């Protein structure tokens, strides 16, 4: 059965290329994008917890404490702390 | 001390207090001239 999958993927990937749009569902509620923002802002803050006192276990063998402390992350921490200005803080 | 999330909880409370003080000064200016 695995060999049948091999012969299938080898054949239709060899067939001539088709135009294929990557156009995904608009049924995402704005609350779905709201908890999407909430998980980003909370994870940036909890990452700051794990930096100052050592609790940061990486998800990469080689991504050190210095590798995640980019100047890009420093600006992301400025956004994460000062987020409550224009976010309507009853929500995230 | 204050590190990470407690900074964001700090800025959220002062930003809330700024909006709160703006709307009560809005009402109290109407009340004093009344």
């Amino acid at each position: 059965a695995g060999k049948e999958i091999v012969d299938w993927c080898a054949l239709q990937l060899k067939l001539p290329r088709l135009e294929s749009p990557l156009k995904f569902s608009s049924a995402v509620l704005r609350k779905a994008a709201d908890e999407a923002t909430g998980e980003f802002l909370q994870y940036i803050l909890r990452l700051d917890r794990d930096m100052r006192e050592g609790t940061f276990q990486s998800g990469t063998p080689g991504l050190t404490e210095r590798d995640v402390a980019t100047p890009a992350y420093e600006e992301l921490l400025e956004f994460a702390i000062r987020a409550s200005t224009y976010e309507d803080p009853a929500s995230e | 001390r204050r590190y990470g999330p407690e900074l964001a909880h700090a800025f959220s409370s002062l930003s809330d207090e700024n909006k709160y003080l703006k709307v009560k000064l809005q009402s109290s200016q109407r009340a004093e001239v009344r």
């Binding site: 200005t85 224009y86 976010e87 309507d88 | 930003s15 700024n18 909006k19």
Partner: peptide, 14 residues
């Protein structure tokens, strides 16, 4: 400027 520190300030001033 006058320091638009709300969510209503960037709405009404813009």
């Amino acid at each position: 400027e006058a320091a638009l520190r709300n969510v209503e300030e960037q709405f009404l001033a813009q």
